[PDB]
From Swiss-Prot:
Gelsolin-like repeats lie at residues 18-59. Tyrosine phosphorylation is induced by epidermal growth factor (EGF) and stimulates cell migration. Phosphorylated on tyrosine residues by SRC. The unphosphorylated form increases the initial rate of actin-nucleating activity, whereas the tyrosine-phosphorylated form inhibits actin-nucleating activity, enhances actin-bundling activity and enhances actin-severing activity by reducing high Ca(2+) requirements. The tyrosine-phosphorylated form does not regulate actin-capping activity. This is Villin-1. The gene is VIL1. Monomer. Homodimer; homodimerization is necessary for actin-bundling. Associates with F-actin; phosphorylation at tyrosine residues decreases the association with F-actin. Interacts (phosphorylated at C-terminus tyrosine phosphorylation sites) with PLCG1 (via the SH2 domains). Interacts (phosphorylated form) with PLCG1; the interaction is enhanced by hepatocyte growth factor (HGF). It comes from Homo sapiens (Human). The chain holds residues 614 to 719 of 827 of the full protein.
Amino acid sequence: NLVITPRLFECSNKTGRFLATEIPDFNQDDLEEDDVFLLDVWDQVFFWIGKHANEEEKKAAATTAQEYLKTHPSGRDPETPIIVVKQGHEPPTFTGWFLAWDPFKW
């Protein structure tokens, strides 16, 4: 009976500092090669890595993902897996959460 609206977060250090921002009514065009994104689907979190994400941003995102899983929401299964997804190699369990997916994007 679980009803899950997925949440997409962009993790970026381009701005100067590092923030994870939740992306309202997200779509595929919100994803970008330069950044890492977290797609929280409740029973797992996809860790989506853009083609041109740097190591510094990836590590920052990894910390936010591990920190994030504590704070929001509380009362959440500690064995929630983080699943690595690389840009252009997204599995159907990932793309299935988007209203529309263009497989020729990028």
